C-alpha cells in the first residue's frame, strides 16, 4: 500500500460508526503500523478489542482536556515508536445545551471556550507534544465541518471552535513546513456517528444533503478514510494548510431543491 | 447626516490612534448620537474628554473579560437609552509572549483561550446581554483581520481567535437577522495604534502593505470610520453577515513585489 | 450628499425595475452629476425620459459587442465630460437557450463566447477606452452574482461569465489603483427585472431566498442603489478589488429549510 | 495500483517537462490503462514515442479549438475504448501580447475570447463529446492556477480564463454527479515547462514562490501528477467540483517575506 513503512497515532475511534475508525481502517490497507488513544475507561475495552483487528497492541489513554495527560501518553509512545510519522486527530466536543436553538440565547462563555479548548486547541497542543518526534515527510490530520465557513441552525458554537480549527491548520502548515511537516483537514459531509446524535435535528440534516449532494448520496466513512490516508502518504507532498472538502459536491451548490 | 436619529454605542477608544476614534469621529459627523465604554480607571479620563468633544456625557466602564461587568454597563446604559441602535466592538487581546516567534511554540492553552475569550466571545456576549435593548433596524459591527485568513507570522493565535470572530459574524446574522437586526465586520488593514506596538515586526508589515497594495497607501482609521459609518446606517440595509475588506485591496494581489 | 461634485456614468438602464434605475436614484439623491448610456433605438425613449426626471440630458448610445460604439461614446461624452469619475457597469447577456437546462447539454461554444465577451470583457473594454478620461479619486462598478461562486440550476454559464467578471474587478484594481481608480463589484441577490425573467423558475428562485435569507426579504435596488453610490463615492477610499455581496445574507448561511 | 482496470484519456502532452507528462506517469505506475491525444504534427512524434514508453498505442489528433477535430478524436477513440473512465484535460492557451505589462492596455477583444475559449470552455467541450461513452464511476479533471483567485502580475486574461474555468468544474460536477461522473480540478504552483516561458518574468515567480512556501520549495510534475491519480481514482469517492490546491502551502499564507 502506499502507507507502507508509515507510523501514525490515530485518536478518536469510539465505536465502529466513528470517522476515525473508517481513517483507520484505510490506512492498515494501505500498509501503515497503526497506534490508537482513548479518552478514558469508558472506551477502552471497544478500542483494545479494535486495535488488535488492525494489528496493534499500542493503545494509550489520552484526555486531552490535560496537558500532563497528552505528554505521558507521548512519553509511554516515545517507549516504542521514539519517532512516528503524524497522527490523525479527529475529537470534538461542546457541552450539549450548546447545540439546541437560537444560537445567541445558547451560547455561553464557559460552553464557548470549552468548544474552542477541546475542538481547536488540542489539535497545536498534540504537535507542540510530539514536535522533536516527527520524522521529516510527517503529516498532520484534523477533521472539520461546513459549518466553520456558513451558519447552520444548532451546529452553534462548534461553527466557531471549527472556524479556529481550519485556521490552525494554515498556521501550523506556516510554522512546521520548514522541518518538513505537511498539515490538513479533510472538512467531512454528515456522517452518522455517535456525536453527531447530539446534534439537534441531525437526521433532518443528513435527508437533506442526500437530496441535494451532486453526487446524490451521503458520504461514508470509508469516502473520508481513503482521503485521509492520501493526505497522510506521501503521494500528497505537494499539499499542506489545505482543507479538502469531502462533502459529495454539497458545499458547492446552491438552490438544487 | 445619513446616521441622523441613530444611537449608537462605541468600545475601544484608548487614545486619538484607535481604530474606535475614528469610527467615532465619521459617526457623529453623519448625526449619530454616541455612547462610550471605557476598559479601566487607566483609560477613563482620555475617553470621557474625547466623549465631550463629540457632544456625548454617557461613558461607562465595561472588561468584557466579566459578564457582570456587561450586565451592569448596559443596565446603566438602559437609564438613559431604554433602547438603542447598535454598538461597535473593536476590541482585542491576547498575552504579549503569544505574538512572537514560531506559533506552535509560542502558543499555549492560557493564551490561547484569553485571545478568544476576549477577541472573540465578548462580540456575543454583548449581544446578548442588549437583545431586548435594540430597535428594529439596528446593525452590530466588529473589527477583523487578514490574519484570519492566511497564516501570518507573529499574529500567531489571534489569526485563530480572528477566524472564530468571523464565524461569530454569520451566526449571529443568521440567529438575529429576524427580528431586524443585521451583524457585519471589517478586516482591517494595518493601521499604526497602540495595540499594534505588541505585534513584533508591525513596522515591516507597513511598510510592506504600503509598497504592494493596490492604491499604494496603508488606510487610515477616517477610511475604516467612513465604512463602518455606512455599515451601521440604513443604506446598507441589504448586507448582513459580511466581512468587507478595507485594506486598499492589498488581500486580492499576489507577488505585487 | 456624499456623491457632491462627481460626474458618473450609468449604463443599463432598461426600465424602472432595473438594477441600474435605483443605482441612478441613489446616486442622483446623493448629489452626483449623470449621464446614461442606451443600447438600441428600442430603448432610446424610456432611458431619454428617465435621464430627464434626474437631471441629466447626457444620453449616448452604446452597444458593448463593438469596439467603435464604445469608442465613439466616449468621444462624445468627452465634448461634455473631458474627464469624469467612474462608471457603473450594469450589463449582462447570454442567448436564452443557454439558460433552460442541464447545463452541459445546453452550453455551446458560441453561447459561451457570447456571454463572457458582453458579461464581462465590456467592463474591462469600457475601462480600456476612458482610461485617460478619469480623474484621481475614481471608481468604477460593476454587478455579479452568487452563481460565479456556486453551482445554481438554469443560471449555466452565466455563472462562468459571472466568476471570469469577478477576477476583472481584481486585475483591473491591481492594474488601476496606482493611478488613483478603485474598482469593485455587488454581488446583489435576485430582484425581479426584465433580464431575470429569462432565466428559467426565476420566480422559484425568488420564493426561496425570500424564505431563508437571515433577513427575512430580498434585496430591493433601493438596497443595491444605496451601496452601490457609497461604493463610488470618497467614503470607500479604502476598498478596491471588492465583491460585496448585497443579499440580505442568503449566501452565508445553509440549511436554513 | 489503485487505478487498475480505469482507463484514462490524457491531453496536453507536449515534452517531458509538461505536467500532463508526470500525470501520465503516476496514472500508469498505479496501473492505469492511457490513451492521449496531441495538438498537432509539430508534437505527433514526442506523444507517439512517451506513449510507447507507457505501454499505450493509443495517439490521436485533437485540436480543441474546432468541434469537428473533438467529434472526431473520441469517434476514433470509441473503436478502442467504446467506453471509458474519464480524461485529463490540461490546456492552455492565449496570443503571447497578453501575457505582458499592464492588463487593462494588454488585453483586446480577440485575445480575452481565445483566451476562455481553449483554456475554459474546451473542458465542457470535450465532456459533452463524450459524455454517453464514460462509466459510471468516472472522472474528469482540469489544471487550474492562483491567478484565478488572485490578480498577478502579467498573468493578466489567463487569471478570467483560469476563473471561468473553476466556475466551469462546479457546473459541471453538478450537472454529471447524478449519472456518476466527478469532476474536480487541481490549482499548481509555478512549475518550469514549456507554456510557462510564456510567463513575462516566471522565473522571478519562481524563485519568489521557493522562498515563501511553507514547505519551502516549489511542487513537482510528480507531485501534481500523485494528487491527480488519486483524485481520477476511487479513492476520491467521495469528492467531486472541488478545486485542490497542490502548491505547497503558498496561497494560505501571506507576509512570509
Ligand atoms: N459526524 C459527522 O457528520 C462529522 C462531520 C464533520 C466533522 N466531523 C468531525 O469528525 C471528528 C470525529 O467525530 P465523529 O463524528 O467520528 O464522532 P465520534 O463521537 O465517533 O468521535 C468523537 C470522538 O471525540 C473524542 N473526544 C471528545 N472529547 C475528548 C477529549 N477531551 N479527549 C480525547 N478525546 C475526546 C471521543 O472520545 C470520540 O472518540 C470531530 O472532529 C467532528 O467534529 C464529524
Ligand atoms: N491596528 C490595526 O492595524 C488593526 C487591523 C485589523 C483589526 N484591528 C482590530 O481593531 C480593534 C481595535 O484595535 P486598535 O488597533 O484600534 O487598538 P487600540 O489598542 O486603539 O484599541 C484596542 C482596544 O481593546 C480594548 N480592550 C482590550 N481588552 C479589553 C477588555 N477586556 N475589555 C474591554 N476592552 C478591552 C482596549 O481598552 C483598547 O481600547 C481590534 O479588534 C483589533 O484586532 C486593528
Ligand atoms: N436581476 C437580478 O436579480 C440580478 C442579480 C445579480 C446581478 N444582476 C446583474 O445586474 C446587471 C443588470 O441586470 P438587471 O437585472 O438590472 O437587468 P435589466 O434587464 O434591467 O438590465 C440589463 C441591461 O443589460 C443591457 N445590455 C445587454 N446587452 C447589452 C449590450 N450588448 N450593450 C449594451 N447594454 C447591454 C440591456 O440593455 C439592459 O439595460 C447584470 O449585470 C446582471 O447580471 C441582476
Ligand atoms: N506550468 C505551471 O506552473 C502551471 C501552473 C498551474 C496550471 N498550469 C496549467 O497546467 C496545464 C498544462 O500546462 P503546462 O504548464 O504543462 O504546459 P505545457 O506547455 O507542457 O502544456 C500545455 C499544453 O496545452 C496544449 N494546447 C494548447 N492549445 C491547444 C489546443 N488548441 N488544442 C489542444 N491542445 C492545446 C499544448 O499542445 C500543450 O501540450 C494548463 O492548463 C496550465 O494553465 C501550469
Ligand atoms: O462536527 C460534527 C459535524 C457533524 Cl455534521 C456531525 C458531528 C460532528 O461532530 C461533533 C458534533 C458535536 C459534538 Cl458536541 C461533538 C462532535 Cl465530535
Ligand atoms: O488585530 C490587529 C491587527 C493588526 Cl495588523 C494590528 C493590531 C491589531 O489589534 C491587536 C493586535 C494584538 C493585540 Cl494583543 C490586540 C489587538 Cl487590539
Ligand atoms: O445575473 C442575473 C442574476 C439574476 Cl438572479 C437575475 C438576473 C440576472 O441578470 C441577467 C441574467 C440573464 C441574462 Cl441573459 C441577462 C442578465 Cl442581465
Ligand atoms: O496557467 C499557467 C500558470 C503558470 Cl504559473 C505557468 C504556466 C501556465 O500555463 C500557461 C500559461 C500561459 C499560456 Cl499562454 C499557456 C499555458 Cl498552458
Redo the contacts with the bound molecule.
Sequence with gaps: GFLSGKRILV?????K?????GIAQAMHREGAELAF????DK?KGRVEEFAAQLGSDIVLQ????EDA?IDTMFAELGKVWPKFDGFV?????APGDQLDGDYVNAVTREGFKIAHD??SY?FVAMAKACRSMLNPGSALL?????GAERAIPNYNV?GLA?AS?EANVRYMANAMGPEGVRVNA???????????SGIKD?RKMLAHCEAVTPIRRTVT?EDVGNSAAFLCSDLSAGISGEVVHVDGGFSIAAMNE
Aim: aromatic share 10%.
Design positions: 485518536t478518536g475511534v469510539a465505536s460508526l466513528s470517522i476515525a475508525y488513544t482513548y479518552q478514558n472506551l489520552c484526555d486531552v482536556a495527560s486527530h479527529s475529537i470534538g466536543f477541546i475542538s488540542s484534523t477533521l472539520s465541518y461546513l462548534m471549527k480549527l479533510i472538512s467531512a459531509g454528515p456522517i452518522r456517528t455517535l456525536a453527531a441531525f466513512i
